[PDB]
Amino acid sequence: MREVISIHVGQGGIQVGNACWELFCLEHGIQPDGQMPSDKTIGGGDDAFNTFFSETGAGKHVPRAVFLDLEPTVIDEVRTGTYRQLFHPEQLISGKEDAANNFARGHYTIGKEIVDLCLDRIRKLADNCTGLQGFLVFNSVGGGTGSGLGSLLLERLSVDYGKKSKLGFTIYPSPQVSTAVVEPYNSILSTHSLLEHTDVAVMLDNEAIYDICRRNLDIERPTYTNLNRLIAQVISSLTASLRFDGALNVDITEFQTNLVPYPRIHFMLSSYAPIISAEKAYHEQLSVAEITNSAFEPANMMAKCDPRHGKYMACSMMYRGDVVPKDVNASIATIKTKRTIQFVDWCPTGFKVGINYQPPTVVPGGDLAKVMRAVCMISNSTAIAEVFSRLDHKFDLMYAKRAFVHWYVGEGMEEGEFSEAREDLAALEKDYEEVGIETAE
Amino acid sequence: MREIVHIQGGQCGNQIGAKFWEVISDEHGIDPTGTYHGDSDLQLERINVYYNEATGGRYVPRAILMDLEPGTMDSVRAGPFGQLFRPDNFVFGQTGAGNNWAKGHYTEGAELIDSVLDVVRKEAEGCDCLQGFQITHSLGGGTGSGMGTLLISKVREEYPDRIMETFSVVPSPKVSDTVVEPYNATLSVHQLVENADECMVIDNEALYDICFRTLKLTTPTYGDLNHLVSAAMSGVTCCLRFPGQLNSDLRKLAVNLIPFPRLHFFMIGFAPLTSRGSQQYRALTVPELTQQMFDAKNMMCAADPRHGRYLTASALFRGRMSTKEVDEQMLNVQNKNSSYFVEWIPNNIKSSICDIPPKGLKMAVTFVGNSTAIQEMFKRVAEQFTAMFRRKAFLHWYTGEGMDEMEFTEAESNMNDLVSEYQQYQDAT
Ligand SMILES: [Mg+2]
């Protein structure tokens, strides 16, 4: 009735996915094998797990998500891991020789190799599904298939269904921290082929995960376990409406042309809170106002792009748990109140409340403390264009020096893809350039 | 029999009517199961004009469910009194409007209207002398308005004699629960000014103000709020439901309320409203509740009588009293603040009484007066629509529905026309 499905790519990406399905399975508490601890009573009023966990004729409830990546080592760990009763073989599609972070390889070269298997799996699930709203696709501009092969993936999947929503979680090159140097190539080559195949998607950067887990989670020494846990929470709440009763169970498609008013600049930030320790869970109270005012801390901004340097457009503060329409509401007045913040005035307010009544659940072994209320500030501003500009200037020079270009030209891409894709970020620079212009008079 | 029906869409409104029928059940004291457990035939006398007996005495509503996604259908389907329903009416959607009103009006609007208007029509045959029906949604989106626009058009044509008393939620000036509100709203209100017979304004912030200040409550939700409003919307048919030494129906009301058909947006006042201690401060008199009646703080709408002028004013009284008081306070008040009483409408205040108040209280008051203060309401919402329509902000979600902008101009100079229209009537003597 209300389905979504997750797709996983790139090393960090399927790392995220593993964390996620660990999470949801924890949260509905269905045991890793595929059974719930106990029988399910027959009831109505709304869906349940049925969105994602797959009903069998018995205690076998597998996700509705798919793995695809050409670097097949790690995924085997899932193939080995505790959830080897959880998942399902045909759920698993991997490539042996990954891209080597040639975008053009797993996009072009090995792009040709596994696509059809992917699409068949997709047809099996969507055919298995009925009211699948949209598509959860995860990848990374690092684990190279996460850029290339995913690029073809949406490039064709969109042309397959279209009417489904594109739920885009991919990681963005951290501003000064990194993984490689061809990242310019991965990213921008992705981007010009990303945009028109993307509906909307958010940009998760890691350095924020570090700084904030270390200060706010009080973390001393983190890694992808903590990161994947954190994105696990954020996606855990970004879709609760289709999973749990909330006052305004807003929906993705609902989010689509309302958060991203124009068609073009359709990405965003997301600073979840309240992430604190057990020793800050106590020694604190964690007000709605604390999560709320705290929600707009630029230093809390969960992607390393200063909001205060941008002007907000929309903010879908979907809330978990014991939320009051009034209290949050006045907090939103407080958000109108913030002098430092500046909004796409031709969209004076574009707010859209989310009050889901389940407060958050915590993953044992985790660092986040337990609370009563969650916020997701999926918000869109002018600010985020800048780091892009860093990307196209860095890539600008490096590409000017023809660095690495032999690698890509060797695999079947043309140079005008490069300069033209730079025209692509040129245009989007005109977009964040223009939409931020205040309409005259 | 002047019986009527209910139809609800709306992100909230679907909940609203749930509370509403809930309340009426209380005033009819029939079990959740659907049989009567009360103490006077009077609850049974006029029971039909909202309810419907069933074979075996299943007593049922004349309600119509609107929704574009079954969750609400499950929700109220999970509702106490849920066994008091008919499974037939659970007419919902598989998609949701996403509140682009064109989506809920063309896309899904045209998609699911048919099954509704059919079964509703089967209810139309179920109605002997249908006084009307009650629609409910919100005027800012599509979860209700998406289709409810089509309802008002279709049934309005299909039943050009029936009353269409329309309550839908108005976006408060301060808090924008969505930014596509000016557009859904304006596109709707173009329709509603043409097609709807009665309308009363549904703000949230007023209801907050009532709960927090005058209710002295800290914890606001919807459900209490729908209690506060279904109190009034439940009062409205009281005489029509029960005897009254001074009775007046919706026809007598609107015809006795509206000078010209474009003025069926009405504001609302209901009372008393206390917290528990208050009774041990104060007691109940007709003059007392009168002294609440003309309270801007009970003025549950974005319009200010303190700023605008009462084009009309009326009182809905349920209880047992002396009208010799009632009128006396009436005229007294019609003098006391004459200036906010429009001039050439002599005795612009008008009266009523129901022999029984609502349950639990001894006397009832209701005020659905109509000033023209709403002009700031339309002016605001039209203004925001104006700004982002300069920007075309989220036109792409919009034109993706395949409407034209010229429609936006139509509801635009339209709605401005209605505003200035209220200006001249307010500015005249
Ligand atoms: Mg790989």
Author numbering:
A (entry chain A): 1 to 441
B (entry chain B): 1 to 429
Quote what the paper states about this structure:
In this study, we obtain high-resolution structures of multiple repeat units of the doublet by single particle cryo-electron microscopy (cryo-EM), reveal the remarkable interactions at the outer junction, and discover an inner sheath of MIPs inside the doublet. To structurally analyse the doublet, cilia were isolated from Tetrahymena thermophila and split into individual doublets using ATP treatment.
However, the resolution was limited for accurate modelling of the tubulin dimer. To obtain a higher resolution structure of tubulin for modelling, we generated the PF map by boxing out each PF from the doublet density map, aligning and averaging. T. thermophila tubulin dimer structure was modelled based on previous tubulin structure and refined using PHENIX.refine17 in this PF map. The above tubulin model was then fitted to the doublet density map to construct a pseudo-atomic model of the doublet. Tubulin model structures fitted well in the doublet map except for PF-B1 (discussed later).
